[PDB]
Write a protein that binds this ligand. Structure first.
Ligand code: HEM
Length: 152
């Protein structure tokens, strides 16, 4: 649950992402894959990537980064009223991709890391607080659907 002022911070930060969605999406996935190499094994189309240089050179990884952040941005713009947008993603990630909630924690922290890396000194403590709360809400509502499905 976020206040109006917190949502305003989230959507202000998101403007930074929308200026370069592919570059942000690429770096988020690279941070996930290099920090948590077990996550790469869930992607049949990226498991061939052995080095970060190959990851950086992969145009399909940048494409998928655009898909991921476009979906997340659509959810964030609903300011919590995201049941219709979130349900299909919860279902596909639990039942088809088999993504444990832990990996959603990993990618949430990766987003925070990338924002500081690309905007050092321009991602203030209030903005980090609000973005963190928004990603916690996203993860918590996914977790509720995971529990319904019995997925661990
Ligand atoms: C912010 C969190 C995430 C968002 C918004 C997101 C979004 C998406 C979307 C929109 C798709 C394509 C449609 C679909 O299959 O539902 C997708 C596919 C997929 N996601 Fe995610 N995802 C997220 C996190 C993760 C994480 C953490 C993992 C694994 C560590 C993951 C694994 C996958 C896989 C394996 C696919 C299929 C890729 C393919 O072969 O095309 N997702 N995701």
């Amino acid at each position: 649950g976020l206040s109006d002022g917190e949502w305003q911070q989230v959507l202000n930060v998101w403007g930074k992402v929308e200026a370069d969605i592919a570059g942000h999406g690429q770096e988020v996935l690279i941070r996930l894959f290099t920090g948590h190499p077990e996550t790469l094994e869930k992607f049949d189309k990226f498991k061939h990537l052995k080095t970060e240089a190959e990851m950086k050179a992969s145009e399909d990884l940048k494409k998928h980064g655009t898909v991921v952040l476009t979906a997340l941005g659509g959810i964030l713009k609903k300011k919590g009223h995201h049941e219709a947008e979130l349900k299909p993603l919860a279902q596909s990630h639990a039942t088809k991709h088999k993504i444990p909630i832990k990996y959603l924690e990993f990618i949430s922290d990766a987003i925070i890391h990338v924002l500081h890396s690309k905007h050092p000194g321009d991602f203030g403590a209030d903005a980090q607080g609000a973005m963190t709360k928004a990603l916690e809400l996203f993860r918590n509502d996914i977790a509720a659907k995971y529990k319904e499905l019995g997925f661990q």
